[PDB]
Design a protein around this ligand. Structure first.
Ligand code: ZN
Lengths: 189, 100, 315, 248
RNA sequence: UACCGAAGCAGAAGUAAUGUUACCGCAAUAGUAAUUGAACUUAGUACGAGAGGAACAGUUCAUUCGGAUAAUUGGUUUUUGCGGCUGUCUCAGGCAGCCGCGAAGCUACCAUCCGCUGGAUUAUGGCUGAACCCUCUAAGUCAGAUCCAUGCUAGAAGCGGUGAU
RNA sequence: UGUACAACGGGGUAUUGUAAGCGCUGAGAUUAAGCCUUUGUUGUCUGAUUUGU
């Protein structure tokens, strides 16, 4: 269930990765083991899309969404948006949101049933079809959510790890107590 | 690429041209040449300046989701672009003739 | 200071016994610079697939015709020109190159040699057989068709190009057949091919290697300056022409960087003198958009078709 | 010259260096720190002992006395974890400080094994450390009861006695008991290919180009979905503009 | 800083005017270099009780310096350019004046493109093999950086071919 | 003694923001003093003077 990987020796894996129940986003790179680990566990059940946002290496902060649809920041290039639309299945929607700060995931976290952040709130609710009430310090899914009180006590829970309804990923700095906490909060066992 | 419209004069901004300093305030700065950038810096009111479309369009001098990009969809754009360009050119010519 | 307006090729690539007879170098006239944007498909780069922006020079390359062939004997004191042979004809601008007072001079160009070529050819065939049995390194004599390039120079620059094929018998046979023929620019270079540039600066001569040809310009068809993405009916020439240059109406070559020498200066190209193994050379340079805005001044438009769009209409 | 002393350390270690090495000798060595006559005097003014101890500590295990610690009777340390111990049955084979690290309940634990100098070293390593003292043997009365007789003077270590232990289940049980008792007491070389990795209504145009610019303007603005109806409406508008008299 | 050897060195991490003119050419010769560091995979793998973490190979960058460029950003402007404005009197805002914008230019690490590949050798690693069984040395002999070649700049106020009488 | 050379003509290409005057008027104006081209008009083409198997 759980997975452990290093993004070019980096400890924060959630920054360059994003996971949902219908699609996955991973930053482009030359590490065969990094992508191989994701592919082996996820197989071909969902598309593991090699993509970037506005040409930036980080994608977890920029991208936030659920299985119903994906929200892209304003600064995303049109070519990247078209590539994401092609890679995402027809059943998954994509909507652009006008925001001053391109880091959507810094303040926005959501799952297949609930979301968090009124123009943007209602847009998120409509696109994701979920209720809307700390994105950098929060993580949410259908198996519950985890917030600040991973990666040897890193306080940025929303950047060091990413997890979906059936697969969890954490950095190599994660310790056994942190893995147990992640398993318990997300009721993997 | 993304060809923006210069907000000071509603002019095209082709790739590689113009200046856009990324200020911490996070604002778009779209311009076609140093003239428009300095005019904006000088705070020359585009809505009341004769040589900018922002004022001309009103003074009477002149009139969120992606697309899958299928072969059929683009095929329609080929004729649509020409039709829209012809309509706009004819409307502008009629407006100029009326102004004369 | 340089010896002349044109530069001399000091070396040539190693010969290939198996490859067919082909030219090794080409020359043209500088035509300023232009901006271009392309997708950086270089692997292992933090800007993979990003729209990298950089400047690319433009060089006018009018068709070059073969006017003669020269063999050289490998003597213990260097290569010696065994025999030069011209082919039955010299162009008006070719003859002009041999006169400092062409207008005043009687223009008494090749007359007996031209009459000699009218003979049964035995002498010419005798020299060809001589070259076949004798020296096995051959260089071709060519000139630039300046009559097509819109330049006030009006003088053709003679240059020598070494053949890289094997079986020098095949070399002389090719010369015997391709005499006084015209060689297109695309026949010597192709897109993504790495070449070096040699020219004279604004006055010393210098050589720069590892320069990739971004685009090979076939000046016969329209939209030569438009990439597969832009694909607009636009020539590389911007509105109003070129800065201190006439116009582009023939084959042209686009090279990464800036070749030495000001505009209208003649430059030469060569195939890097060796097979570069760098991945940069191997990768193909896909093109996205080429700048065509008027360089003279500050052009807010690309072509006159879209120029009126900003103004809508004008008096 | 002083750099040598900087790298030399100076409560268990004080006695440990007195059995694996000589404490007094070590301290004495550490504390014994035109120009022809001066050069000769300096040249005239035991050093190999310092280098030997430095080399010995360069690979010796590093442990804190305050950290949790715990025939074939000597094979327990080899079997418990990835540690190597000499198979020789004679007791004096344990001169070196053998340590084996392992994790119990997400907490680090390690086992340690070890008059002649070796006996003094073992006694100091048992008394000075917080490690518990254990007695393991395979299944004579005086030999077996020797440990029990000497138990009182080190009974503070929370002694535990388990006797048959080559079976792995016994080792696992011993480790589980001791751990709880301690607290209780190839690479990127080519461009990435995205073809066939994305979904589309059909594979006819899978090798898409997306020029994104046409007639000097971006396609993204004109790329509306199935707008043939819009084109027909625009044609009707053009007809109404031409025949109504706007451009008669 | 590069290559080797010792070292409980587990891993991490000693060597250095010419028959004229014109065109196309060869090259004895003189000079010669890229430079310093960083990131990615094998890389969480060999190693190791654990802290710790490789490498031959293949990739991506950055600082300084060298050869060039102004497609465009800036330092910038005798285009004293367009428009405005104040003395000067009979709209010219004149001119020895100021302002907003300003092509063109010299020019920048203040920006852009590029900046080497084949051999003989010191030490060293080895084979065959005597003085004297052995031995890399005595005769032979493979690998290997300082040197020579490749490329680049100029061409003896040296040389070859070609056209005109 | 001919789409060869130069000056004019138009066009395109840069600075401009609406000169003076009565919406004309992104017009005109510098218009190349370090821009280009072309479709029309005009003139150009003769001396001094040195060398050669
Ligand atoms: Zn503008």
């Amino acid at each position: 269930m759980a997975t452990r990987t290093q993004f070019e020796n980096s400890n924060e894996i959630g920054v360059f990765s994003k996971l949902t129940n219908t699609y996955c986003l991973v930053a482009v790179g030359g590490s065969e083991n990094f992508y191989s680990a994701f592919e082996a566990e996820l197989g071909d059940a969902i598309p593991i899309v090699h993509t970037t946002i506005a040409g930036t290496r980080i994608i977890g902060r920029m991208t936030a969404g659920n299985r119903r649809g994906l929200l892209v920041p304003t600064q995303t290039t049109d070519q990247e948006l078209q590539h994401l639309r092609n890679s995402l299945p027809d059943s998954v929607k994509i909507q652009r949101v006008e925001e001053r700060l391109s880091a959507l995931g810094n303040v926005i976290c959501c799952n297949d049933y609930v979301a968090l952040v009124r123009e943007t709130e209602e847009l998120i609710s409509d696109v994701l079809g979920v209720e809307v009430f700390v994105g950098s310090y929060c993580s949410l899914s259908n198996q519950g959510g985890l917030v600040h009180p991973v990666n040897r006590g890193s306080s940025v829970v929303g950047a060091g790890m990413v997890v979906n309804d059936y697969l969890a990923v954490t950095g190599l700095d994660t310790t056994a107590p942190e893995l147990s906490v992640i398993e318990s909060i997300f009721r993997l066992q | 690429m993304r060809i923006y419209q210069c907000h000071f004069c509603s002019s095209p901004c082709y790739p590689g041209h113009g200046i856009m300093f990324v200020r911490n305030d996070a604002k778009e700065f779209r311009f076609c040449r140093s003239k428009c950038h300095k005019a904006f810096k000088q705070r020359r009111n585009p809505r009341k300046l004769k040589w900018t479309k922002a004022f001309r369009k009103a003074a009477g001098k002149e009139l969120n989701v992606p697309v899958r990009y299928n072969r059929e969809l683009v095929a329609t754009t080929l004729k649509a672009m020409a039709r829209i360009e012809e309509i706009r050119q004819k409307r502008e010519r009629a407006f100029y003739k009326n102004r004369m | 200071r340089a010896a002349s307006i044109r530069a001399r090729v000091k070396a040539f690539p190693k010969d290939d016994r198996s490859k067919p007879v082909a030219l090794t170098s080409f020359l043209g006239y500088k035509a300023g610079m232009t901006t271009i944007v392309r997708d950086l498909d270089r692997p292992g780069s933090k800007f993979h697939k990003r729209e990298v922006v950089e400047a690319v020079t433009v060089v006018d390359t009018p068709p070059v015709v073969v006017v003669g062939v020269v063999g050289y004997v490998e003597t213990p004191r260097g290569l010696r020109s065994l025999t030069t042979v011209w082919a039955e004809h010299l162009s008006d601008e070719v003859k002009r190159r041999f006169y400092k007072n062409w207008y005043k001079s009687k223009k008494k160009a090749f007359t007996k040699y031209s009459a000699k070529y009218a003979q049964d050819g035995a002498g010419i065939e005798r020299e060809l057989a001589r070259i076949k049995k004798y020296a096995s390194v051959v260089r071709v004599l060519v000139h630039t068709q300046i009559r097509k390039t819109p330049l006030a120079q009006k003088k053709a620059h003679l240059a020598e190009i070494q053949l890289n094929g094997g079986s020098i018998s095949e070399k002389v046979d090719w010369a015997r057949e391709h005499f006084e023929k015209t060689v297109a620019v695309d026949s010597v270079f192709e897109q993504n091919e790495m070449i070096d540039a040699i020219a004279v600066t604004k006055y010393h001569s210098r050589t720069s290697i590892n320069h990739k040809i971004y685009r090979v310009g076939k000046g016969d068809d329209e939209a030569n300056g438009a990439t597969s993405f832009d694909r607009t009916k636009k020539t590389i020439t911007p509105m109003g022409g070129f800065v201190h240059y006439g116009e582009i109406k023939n084959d042209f070559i686009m090279v990464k960087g800036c070749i030495p020498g000001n505009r209208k200066r003649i430059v030469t190209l060569r195939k890097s003198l060796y097979t570069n193994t760098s991945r940069k050379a191997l990768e193909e340079v896909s093109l996205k958009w080429i700048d065509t805005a008027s360089k003279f001044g500050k052009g807010r438009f690309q072509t006159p078709a879209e120029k009126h769009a900003f103004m809508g209409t004008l008096k | 010259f002083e750099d040598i002393l900087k790298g030399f350390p100076n409560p268990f270690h004080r006695d440990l260096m007195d059995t694996l090495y000589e404490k007094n000798h070590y301290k004495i060595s550490l504390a014994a720190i035109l120009k022809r006559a001066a050069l000769g005097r300096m040249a005239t003014i035991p050093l190999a002992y310092l280098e030997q101890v430095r080399q010995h500590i360069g690979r010796l295990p590093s442990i804190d006395p305050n950290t949790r610690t715990l025939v074939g009777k000597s094979s327990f340390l080899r079997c418990i974890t990835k540690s190597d111990v000499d198979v020789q049955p004679y007791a004096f084979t344990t001169k070196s400080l053998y340590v084996g690290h392992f994790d119990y309940k997400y907490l680090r634990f390690q086992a340690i094994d070890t008059m002649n100098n070796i006996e003094m070293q073992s006694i100091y390593a048992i008394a000075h450390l917080r490690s518990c003292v254990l007695y393991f043997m395979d299944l004579i009365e005086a030999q077996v009861k020797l440990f029990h007789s000497i138990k009182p003077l080190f009974a503070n270590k929370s002694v535990m006695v388990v006797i048959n232990c080559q079976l792995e289940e016994n080792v696992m049980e011993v480790r589980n008991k001791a751990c709880e008792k301690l607290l209780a007491s190839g690479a990127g070389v080519f461009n990435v290919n995205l073809k066939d990795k994305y979904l589309l209504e059909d594979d006819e145009w899978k090798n898409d180009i997306m020029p994104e610019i046409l007639d000097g303007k971006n396609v993204y603005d004109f790329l509306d979905p199935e707008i043939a109806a819009k084109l027909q409406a625009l044609e009707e508008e053009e007809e109404k503009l031409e025949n109504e008299g706007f451009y008669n």
